[PDB]
Design a protein around this ligand. Structure first.
Ligand code: ULV
Ligand code: 5WE
Length: 254
């Protein structure tokens, strides 16, 4: 993989962070100085050679609000993925930690960070295909970044009606999921439609049921997340519009 190939001799493992979706993740250093996360691609977990379109995606996409790939160690097994280190870990766990006592301006900033990454992915005509708080990470400064981008159990509770009924994926199904991710942020990590199963959620969504306004979301913030859930996909905003709406609310409320 040319310049993306990292020499595993340059890595030093400092602590196991936990079992990531797809293998063990560890905090470590590159050439003793740079902080990195090291994902060990689990042995025979998914397909490899042909499935390495995910590395082509990680190697061609780059944004300040996307978790950055630094390199790979593929001349060995298990394969290592070296990425930017996100000290506060997964957004969903970060939201659930009641000790942060978040103010609403901090929650809207988390939405803006994700919206910026998504406007960038929209501009490259790329679909995340699993946008949710579980796939976002938080760095030491509280900056949220989107990870596992377009990786590749179906995320029923983040899907619009046309996806659940017809597998109609579009930029608008990522808009819908983003509205659900804003709801996860403003509810401090509640499971969307927490009283329902996936099957009950799909039928209620087809019937026009929508997630309620979380207590911490103002009417203006709620209007932004609710605009992502229009039944007609063409009536949902673009990520550029959502970003301008979020910036307007931050200037007004803050
Ligand atoms: N960069 C990270 N920093 C800190 C913590 N991190 C965790 C924690 C694991 C334990 C759970 C538990 O608690 C918590 O906070 N969690 C988060 N995962 C990642 C992380 C590291 C690397 C990747 C990664 O390699 N992504 C990738 C890989 C592919 C590829 F190549 F394999 F196809 C394609 C697309 N994306 C993903 C997440 C990171
Ligand atoms: C050489 N000097 C700078 C040493 C810096 C220290 C260094 O080399 N480090 C520190 C951590 C692991 C290792 C490492 N980092 C990277 C990397 C790649 C892209 C961007 C980026 O920002 N890309 C963007 N693309 C578009 C927009 S921004 C940032 C970093 C790479 C790489 N491509 N191959 C091998 C090793 N690599």
């Amino acid at each position: 993989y040319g310049s993306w190939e990292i020499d595993p001799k340059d890595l030093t493992f400092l602590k196991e962070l936990g079992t990531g979706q797809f293998g063990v993740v560890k905090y470590g250093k590159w050439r003793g100085q740079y902080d990195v996360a090291i994902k060990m691609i689990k042995e025979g977990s998914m397909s490899e050679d042909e499935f390495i379109e995910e590395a082509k995606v990680m190697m061609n996409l780059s944004h300040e609000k996307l978790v950055q790939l630094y390199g790979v160690c593929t001349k060995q097994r298990p394969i290592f993925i070296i990425t930017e280190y996100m000290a506060n870990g997964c957004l969903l766990n970060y939201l659930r930690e009641m000790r942060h006592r978040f103010q609403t301006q901090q929650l809207l900033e988390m939405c803006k960070d994700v919206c910026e990454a998504m406007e960038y992915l929209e501009s490259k005509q790329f679909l995340h295909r699993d946008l949710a708080a579980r796939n976002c990470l938080v760095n030491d400064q509280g900056v949220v970044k989107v990870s596992d981008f377009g990786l590749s159990k179906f995320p029923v509770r983040w899907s619009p009606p046309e996806v659940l009924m017809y597998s109609k994926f579009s930029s608008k199904s990522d808009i819908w999921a983003f509205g659900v991710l804003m709801w996860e942020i403003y509810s401090l990590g509640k499971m969307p439609y927490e009283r329902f199963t996936n099957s009950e959620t799909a039928e209620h969504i087809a019937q026009g049921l929508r997630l309620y306004r979380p207590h911490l979301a103002s009417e203006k913030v709620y209007t932004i997340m609710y605009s992502c859930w229009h039944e007609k996909a063409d009536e949902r905003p673009t990520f550029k519009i959502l970003l301008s709406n979020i910036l307007d609310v931050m200037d007004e409320e803050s």
